[PDB]
Amino acid sequence: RTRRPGEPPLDLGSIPWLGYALDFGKDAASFLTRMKEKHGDIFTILVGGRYVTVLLDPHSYDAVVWEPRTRLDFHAYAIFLMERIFDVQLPHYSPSDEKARMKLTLLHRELQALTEAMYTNLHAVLLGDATEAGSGWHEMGLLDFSYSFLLRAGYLTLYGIEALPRTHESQAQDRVHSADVFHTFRQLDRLLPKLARGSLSVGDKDHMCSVKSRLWKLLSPARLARRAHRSKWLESYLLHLEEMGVSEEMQARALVLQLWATQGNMGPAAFWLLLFLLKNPEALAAVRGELESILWQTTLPQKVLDSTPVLDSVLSESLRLTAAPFITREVVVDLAMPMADGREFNLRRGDRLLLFPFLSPQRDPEIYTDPEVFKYNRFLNPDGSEKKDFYKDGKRLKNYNMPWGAGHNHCLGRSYAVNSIKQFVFLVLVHLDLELINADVEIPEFDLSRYGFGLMQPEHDVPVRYRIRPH
Numbered sequence: 514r515t516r517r518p519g520e521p522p523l524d525l526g527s528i529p530w531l532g533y534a535l536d537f538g539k540d541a542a543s544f545l546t547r548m549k550e551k552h553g554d555i556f557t558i559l560v561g562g563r564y565v566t567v568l569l570d571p572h573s574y575d576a577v578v579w580e581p582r583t584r585l586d587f588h589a590y591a592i593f594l595m596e597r598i599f600d601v602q603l604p605h606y607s608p609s610d611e612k613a614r615m616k617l618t619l620l621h622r623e624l625q626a627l628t629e630a631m632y633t634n635l636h637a638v639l640l641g642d643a644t645e646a647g648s649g650w651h652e653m654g655l656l657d658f659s660y661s662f663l664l665r666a667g668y669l670t671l672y673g674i675e676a677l678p679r680t681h682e683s684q685a686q687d688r689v690h691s692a693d694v695f696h697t698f699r700q701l702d703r704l705l706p707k708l709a710r711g712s713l714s715v716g717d718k719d720h721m722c723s724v725k726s727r728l729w730k731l732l733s734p735a736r737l738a739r740r741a742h743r744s745k746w747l748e749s750y751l752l753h754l755e756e757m758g759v760s761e762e763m764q765a766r767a768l769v770l771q772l773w774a775t776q777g778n779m780g781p782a783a784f785w786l787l788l789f790l791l792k793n794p795e796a797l798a799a800v801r802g803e804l805e806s807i808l809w810q811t812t813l814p815q816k817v818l819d820s821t822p823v824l825d826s827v828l829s830e831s832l833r834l835t836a837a838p839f840i841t842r843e844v845v846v847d848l849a850m851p852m853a854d855g856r857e858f859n860l861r862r863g864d865r866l867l868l869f870p871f872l873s874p875q876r877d878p879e880i881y882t883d884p885e886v887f888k889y890n891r892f893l894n895p896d897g898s899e900k901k902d903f904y905k906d907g908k909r910l911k912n913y914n915m916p917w918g919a920g921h922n923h924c925l926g927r928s929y930a931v932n933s934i935k936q937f938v939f940l941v942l943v944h945l946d947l948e949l950i951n952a953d954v955e956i957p958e959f960d961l962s963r964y965g966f967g968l969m970q971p972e973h974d975v976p977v978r979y980r981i982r983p984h
């Protein structure tokens with residue numbers, strides 16, 4: 514490994530073959546920050562046997578993300594992750610064909626069906642669980658709270674319900690079944706990073722295999738076939754799998770993968786958002802105020818969804834601070850990469866290209882002043898309208914907040930995710946009293962091993978209590 518003309522700064526580290534494998538794995542954001550300081554906005558580093566070209570200039574992300582698979586490929590790493598984490602291997606298929614197919618079942622008239630179904634499931638699960646436990650305060654971790662209700666409602670919306678004439682007894686069974694899905698799923702979720710790195714102990718391995726075994730049985734095509742009000746998202750996905758001749762037991766494996774892909778972010782996102790509001794009285798008052806004016810003018814007032822500018826900014830800001838996915842490409846053929854300021858750089862076939870929006874634009878102090886601070890109105894202009902104008906190096910940024918990925922490898926459920934988070938926040942702030950146990954609790958650190966998977970998770974939960982509001 515010697516630099517060719519036109520290639521980025523190259524930094525091999527101290528340890529042979531491994532390189533910066535340890536530093537990157539332990540805390541990728543801290544490590545990559547140091548490397549930005551050392552090398553500027555593009556560098557090639559060696560980590561665990563691979564040469565990773567890191568691009569940290571947000572102005573130059575568009576020259577990379579829209580590139581064809583025959584030049585820059587995202588699918589090889591997804592494929593690898595499917596197998597190593599979820600034990601799914603599927604017949605070769607087109608990712609761009611399937612993403613197009615899937616995204617349609619998550620948009621327009623289907624989204625409207627999902628959005629309506631989501632609100633009644635969120636309501637049924639949240640108010641169902643509170644009514645069962647009774648009218649007093651209930652103590653809970655805020656993550657456990659946010660993740661539980663969103664995943665359980667999300668699961669019931671996408672995977673269907675016990676019954677559709679809709680009874681007291683079917684709704685009660687869905688609360689219990691969905692709680693089982695949540696509690697089992699969470700055991701796998703917690704160990705995802707170790708799964709991906711193959712660092713499970715003998716016991717961890719046995720625990721993971723038993724958890725998978727249960728999840729694969731819960732979400733078997735046979736069990737799902739009896740469920741009512743299944744989503745077009747699900748039904749068309751099942752058909753796609755059948756088309757490829759995938760057996761029912763591998764269908765179940767793929768459905769558990771989809772369970773993670775569709776539910777593994779909303780819960781954690783809402784946790785951080787609610788925590789930031791609980792810690793910032795002026796921010797919470799402005800959110801309450803906006804939702805209350807609409808409430809004063811079981812369906813959801815459409816204005817909560819499409820006319821909540823303060824809430825939109827709160828969600829954008831929350832995600833700015835806590836969404837840390839990797840945008841990752843395999844360099845398929847030797848190529849030239851244009852930077853927005855005139856420069857170009859040579860990418861070598863076999864290298865891995867990594868963009869990390871979390872670091873820039875999201876926590877870039879030249880873009881956002883005090884980027885470490887939650888400022889609820891950061892995405893609002895003084896008149897309360899959505900702020901869309903952000904700058905770096907004397908130029909207006911097209912990409913300034915990128916929690917949903919970019920290019921053709923971006924979130925297929927984004928509108929549904931935003932709508933769902935807003936419905937949950939609305940339900941919590943309007944029906945419930947919600948309180949930190951200790952109002953001076955500090956915001957926990959992330960589990961720093963999770964960088965790159967999507968929404969960050971806290972290294973420990975935050976104790977809260979809630980109740981159905983009494984009068």
Ligand code: HEM
Binds near residue numbers: 927966
């Ligand atoms: C705040 C919540 C969410 C965030 C920040 C988020 C973010 C992302 C990101 C960054 C990706 C790119 C994949 C990657 O990182 O390599 C992605 C893909 C995807 N998203 Fe989301 N997501 C969220 C919620 C959801 C929801 C609610 C759904 C649908 C119910 C969904 C459906 C999908 C699917 C299906 C894919 C990949 C397609 C596949 O492999 O089948 N996401 N998401």
